[PDB]
C-alpha cells in the first residue's frame, strides 16, 4: 500500500501561501524512501533517520510556494510576514519541513504573478489557520468603502518571479508534514 506522496511533492501547480493546500493522509503505508535534487530537510521533534519505521494516526501535508529568504520562517517560534500573516507553525510542532528550489517551474521571463502573499493583516495567525478573505485593509480612520485608495489597500501582494533573479528571491516549493498521534487506532504505519 502506497501513501499518495507522489501527488503532494510532484504537483504541477502549487498554491499561494495565503491559501495553502492541505491534504489529509490516512490508511496507507507511509514510506519515505521516495524522498531520495538539492533540497532542505528539517524535522522537528522526530528522528528523520527512522520516519519509515514510525507509526502514527494522520499525516497532514501542507504545500505552499514562498521566496528563498522566507524558508527559515517555516519553523516553530519564528516571526515574520509569512509566519505572522500567511502560515504559522505551533511551538510544539511534531513534524518535518521539506523545501526545494523551483526556479525551473515557477518562474517565467515575463514574471510570475500567480502567487500571492498576505501583506496587511490586523491580528496574528493562530497555528494552521487559513485566511482566504480579500477584504480591503483599513489603515486609517476613513472607510475603504470597497474602494482601494489612500490608507485602504488590497491585503494580497503578488510575488515577482523571474529566472534572472537571485537565489533568495527565487521560488521555493515548501511541503510541511504534520504528524498527529490519536487515541483512536492509528492507520499510517510504515
Amino acid at each position: 500500500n502506497l501513501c499518495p506522496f507522489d501527488e503532494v511533492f510532484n504537483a504541477t501547480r502549487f498554491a499561494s501561501v495565503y491559501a495553502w493546500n492541505r491534504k489529509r493522509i490516512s490508511n496507507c503505508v507511509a514510506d519515505y524512501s521516495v524522498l531520495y535534487p538539492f533540497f532542505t530537510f528539517k524535522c522537528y521533534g522526530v528522528s528523520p533517520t527512522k520516519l519509515n519505521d514510525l507509526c502514527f494516526t494522520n499525516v497532514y501535508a501542507d504545500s505552499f510556494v514562498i521566496r528563498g529568504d522566507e524558508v527559515r520562517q517555516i519553523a516553530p517560534g519564528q516571526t515574520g510576514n509569512i509566519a505572522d500573516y500567511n502560515y504559522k507553525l505551533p511551538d510544539d510542532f511534531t513534524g518535518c519541513v521539506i523545501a526545494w528550489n523551483s526556479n525551473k517551474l515557477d518562474s517565467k521571463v515575463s514574471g510570475n504573478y500567480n502567487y500571492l502573499y498576505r501583506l496587511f493583516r490586523k491580528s496574528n495567525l493562530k497555528p494552521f489557520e487559513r485566511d482566504i478573505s480579500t477584504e480591503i485593509y483599513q489603515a486609517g480612520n476613513k472607510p475603504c468603502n470597497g474602494v482601494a485608495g489612500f490608507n485602504c489597500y488590497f491585503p494580497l501582494r503578488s510575488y515577482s518571479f523571474r529566472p534572472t533573479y537571485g537565489v533568495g528571491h527565487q521560488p521555493y516549493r515548501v511541503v510541511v508534514l504534520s504528524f498527529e498521534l490519536l487515541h483512536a487506532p492509528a492507520t499510517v504505519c510504515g
Partner: antibody
Amino acid sequence: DVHLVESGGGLIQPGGSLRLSCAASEFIVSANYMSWVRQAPGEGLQWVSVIYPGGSTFYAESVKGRFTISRDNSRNTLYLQMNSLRAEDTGVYYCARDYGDFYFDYWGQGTLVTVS
Amino acid sequence: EIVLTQSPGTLSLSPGERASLSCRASQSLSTYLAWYQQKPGQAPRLLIFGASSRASGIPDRFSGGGSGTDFTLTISRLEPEDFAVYYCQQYGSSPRTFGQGTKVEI
C-alpha cells in the same frame, strides 16, 4: 491630517535612558507598519526598528537589546524606549509609515537626541 | 547588508534640463529599491518605489528605471526646487540599507 509629530528628544548623559513619542493623525498605528529611522548629523539614513500591525518587532543589529519599540492604541502613539545610550546614537530620529516592510511612504518632522 | 553605492558624490547642473543619479548594489535587488529626496533641514520625502513607480504628489519630472544591480534616477527639467540630497534605499533583504546620498548643486 496625515501629520506625524515627534517629541521626547533632548540631551542625555551616556548610559541614560530616553523615551521618544510619535503622535499620529489619520493613521491607525495599531493597523500600520511603523518604523523608526535615525540620521546622524551630516550622514546617511539608518533604519532603527519596525513594528508590525500584528505586534512583531524587529531592530537593527546595532540597537537590539537596548532599544524597544512599542505602541499605545488608546492615544494612537508610537513609543521608542532607548536604554544604555551610547555616544554613537546621537542624531535626528524620525517615525515613518513603512508600506509593508518595504519603504517609508510618510515621515515625521524629526527630533534631535544628543548623547552628551 | 546589501551595500548601496551612489557613483556621483556631488552633481553640479544649471537649472536647465538634465539629471542622472546612479545607485549600484553589491548583489541583485530585483526592482526592490526606492528613491527619497531630502531637502536641507527637512525630513526625507519618498519619490520612487519599486525602482520605476512614482508615489503620490511627485511631478512627472521625476523618473526612475533599473533592475538587478544598477538603478538610475533621472530628472526631466531640473527646476530649482529639485536641488537637494537624494538617497537610494533597498528592501530586498534585511535590513533596509540606505546609500551615502548624492547632493545636487548649481
